[PDB]
Design a protein around this motif. Structure first.
Motif, short mmCIF file in Angstrom:
data_model
loop_
_atom_site.label_atom_id
_atom_site.label_comp_id
_atom_site.label_asym_id
_atom_site.label_seq_id
_atom_site.Cartn_x
_atom_site.Cartn_y
_atom_site.Cartn_z
N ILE A 104 6.40 -2.72 1.41
CA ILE A 104 5.67 -3.52 2.23
C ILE A 104 4.01 -3.42 2.21
O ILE A 104 3.71 -2.40 1.68
CB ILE A 104 5.97 -3.27 3.82
N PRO A 105 3.41 -4.60 2.59
CA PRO A 105 1.99 -4.31 2.13
C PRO A 105 1.28 -3.31 3.20
O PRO A 105 1.85 -3.07 4.33
CB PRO A 105 1.43 -5.86 2.76
N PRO A 106 0.19 -2.66 2.65
CA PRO A 106 -0.38 -1.60 3.41
C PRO A 106 -0.88 -1.89 5.06
O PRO A 106 -1.27 -1.44 5.85
CB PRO A 106 -1.37 -0.96 2.47
N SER A 107 -1.39 -3.50 4.90
CA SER A 107 -2.15 -3.98 6.03
C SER A 107 -1.09 -4.39 7.14
O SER A 107 -1.47 -4.60 8.17
CB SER A 107 -2.85 -5.21 5.69
N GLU A 167 -0.48 -6.93 -1.61
CA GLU A 167 -1.32 -7.80 -0.75
C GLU A 167 -1.39 -9.32 -1.24
O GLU A 167 -1.56 -10.17 -0.49
CB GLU A 167 -2.64 -7.06 -0.89
N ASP A 168 -1.38 -9.59 -2.58
CA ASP A 168 -1.55 -10.59 -3.26
C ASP A 168 -0.54 -10.72 -4.35
O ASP A 168 -0.38 -9.84 -5.09
CB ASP A 168 -2.91 -11.00 -3.85
N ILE A 169 0.46 -11.73 -4.47
CA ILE A 169 1.39 -11.87 -5.30
C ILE A 169 1.06 -13.16 -6.27
O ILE A 169 2.04 -13.33 -7.10
CB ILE A 169 2.75 -11.96 -4.72
N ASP A 170 0.33 -14.05 -6.00
CA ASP A 170 -0.02 -15.29 -6.78
C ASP A 170 -1.24 -15.68 -6.75
O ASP A 170 -1.72 -16.73 -7.42
CB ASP A 170 0.81 -16.41 -6.25
N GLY A 171 -2.37 -14.66 -6.64
CA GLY A 171 -3.71 -14.98 -6.91
C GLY A 171 -4.64 -15.80 -5.70
O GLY A 171 -5.58 -16.14 -5.64
N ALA A 172 -3.62 -16.17 -4.61
CA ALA A 172 -4.30 -16.90 -3.52
C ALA A 172 -4.13 -16.55 -2.21
O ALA A 172 -4.23 -17.18 -1.27
CB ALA A 172 -3.61 -18.36 -3.79
N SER A 215 7.71 -11.22 -15.18
CA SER A 215 7.07 -10.49 -14.08
C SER A 215 8.38 -10.17 -13.21
O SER A 215 9.27 -10.88 -13.13
CB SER A 215 6.12 -10.91 -13.27
N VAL A 216 8.18 -9.39 -12.28
CA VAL A 216 9.20 -9.00 -11.33
C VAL A 216 9.40 -10.03 -10.07
O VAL A 216 10.28 -10.21 -9.51
CB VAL A 216 9.14 -7.63 -10.75
N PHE A 217 8.17 -10.68 -9.80
CA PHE A 217 7.93 -11.68 -8.73
C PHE A 217 8.41 -13.15 -9.29
O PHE A 217 8.79 -14.00 -8.44
CB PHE A 217 6.45 -11.73 -8.27
N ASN A 218 8.61 -13.44 -10.70
CA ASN A 218 8.66 -14.36 -11.17
C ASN A 218 10.03 -14.59 -11.96
O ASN A 218 10.39 -15.56 -12.65
CB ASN A 218 7.84 -14.99 -12.44
N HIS A 219 10.97 -13.54 -11.57
CA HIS A 219 12.14 -13.49 -12.43
C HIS A 219 13.04 -14.82 -11.77
O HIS A 219 13.07 -14.85 -10.69
CB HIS A 219 12.79 -12.21 -12.03
N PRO A 220 13.73 -15.46 -12.61
CA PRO A 220 14.46 -16.69 -12.22
C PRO A 220 16.03 -16.44 -11.64
O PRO A 220 16.72 -17.35 -11.19
CB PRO A 220 14.65 -17.59 -13.28
N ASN A 221 16.28 -15.09 -11.48
CA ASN A 221 17.75 -14.80 -11.06
C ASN A 221 17.73 -13.90 -9.80
O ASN A 221 18.67 -13.62 -9.39
CB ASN A 221 18.48 -14.05 -12.28
N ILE A 222 16.69 -13.72 -9.08
CA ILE A 222 16.47 -12.81 -8.18
C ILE A 222 16.61 -13.52 -6.92
O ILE A 222 16.17 -14.87 -6.87
CB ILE A 222 15.32 -11.79 -7.97
#
Lengths: 106, 156, 53, 52
Positions: A55-58, A94-99, A3-10
């Motif tokens: 950015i998140p909508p909230s 709004e949520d990037i890891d389920g928590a 995924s784009v949030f789990n890329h190891p080079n960013i």
């Protein structure tokens, strides 16, 4: 598939919370956004400049606050100092890891 | 807003690279035998043909004597495990004298002019076992987590 | 000439107004160019920065 | 700084100053080449230098 949030080079930046129990912090957001833009500028040695923010909508309420003792808002000042950039809102942030972890993408 | 300009420095050398244009000598009538050789690692001769003329070389092993160091070439080499190697049954370049960059297993800079210590697998490393007559030429740099050293090679 | 990492210091707005320090400084001092040179990050090999006028 | 011709093939010994001497305290792996010539009160000798 990565995924784009789990890329190891960013580049990932830890941040203080923009909202801490209904207590808006409109300067921390601007400082961190400027830091991220400067990081993109200085990591590619001038060959790439930041152009898009998501950015998140909230969190659109933080950027609508009037700056003290004036009229124009923090978002307007940011755009005046960084003309040439586009800011948008995405509900996937709004949520990037389920928590309940939030994030911003530049 | 005010402009800015940046600056970056090129790396010095790469494994199995001829250091400079001093007096050197390369042998190209040698052929790889029973295996493959990493570029920048020592080799050894197992058998020299009496009448045909070619010499059989292979990766260094314990209780042997090194003969040369394989060097870079963009035509006579193959790309394997993200590196450049010489495959079995093919011509090879073996540098027998001169200054060359080679891989290292050490951690501290060596003293100029001292003897070269070798490891069992054909790479430079201090306090090793295999005995050599080469010298250090005063070169100690790292290319992106790969440790290199400059060695002066004398012909056997 | 200033290091690039100090460009953000000159972009802070002064209190009770909507312009940055750099704009007021440039208005006061006409005819002076300010630029950034990445060689100014480390001037002695230990991370010390510097500004050249 | 010597006065006698050297023997061909023998190892050369240097002096503390850095000039040749028949009996010096610095051991060196170079060699004599045979030449032995003097140019107006300056003593010269031909030396063969080997790579370190």
């Amino acid at each position: 598939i990565v995924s784009v949030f789990n890329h190891p080079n960013i580049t990932k930046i830890t941040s203080g919370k923009w909202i801490d129990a209904s207590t808006m912090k409109p300067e921390t957001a601007e400082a961190e956004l400027t830091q991220a833009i400067e990081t993109i500028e200085t990591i590619t040695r001038g060959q790439h400049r930041a152009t898009n923010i998501l950015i998140p909508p909230s969190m659109r309420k933080v950027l609508a606050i009037r700056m003290p003792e004036t009229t124009m808002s923090y978002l307007d000042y940011f755009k005046s100092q960084n003309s040439g950039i586009e800011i948008d809102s995405i509900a996937e942030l709004e949520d990037i890891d389920g928590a309940g972890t939030k994030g911003v993408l530049v | 807003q005010i402009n800015a300009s940046y600056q970056r420095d090129m790396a010095i050398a790469l494994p199995g690279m001829v250091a400079d244009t001093s007096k050197y000598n390369i042998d190209g009538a040698c052929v790889v035998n029973e295996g493959d050789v990493l570029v920048g690692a020592a080799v050894q001769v197992v058998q020299a043909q009496a009448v045909d003329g070619h010499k059989l070389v292979k990766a260094l092993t314990t209780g042997t004597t090194p003969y040369g160091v394989a060097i870079r070439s963009h035509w006579q080499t193959v790309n394997a495990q993200n590196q450049m190697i010489y495959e079995d049954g093919g011509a090879i370049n073996v540098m027998t004298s001169g200054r060359v960059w080679m891989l290292s297993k050490s951690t501290e800079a060596p003293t100029f002019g001292s003897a070269v210590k070798l490891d069992v697998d054909g790479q430079e490393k201090s306090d090793g076992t295999i005995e050599t007559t080469w010298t250090y030429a005063g070169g100690w740099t790292k290319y992106k987590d790969i440790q290199l050293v400059e060695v002066q090679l004398h012909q056997l």
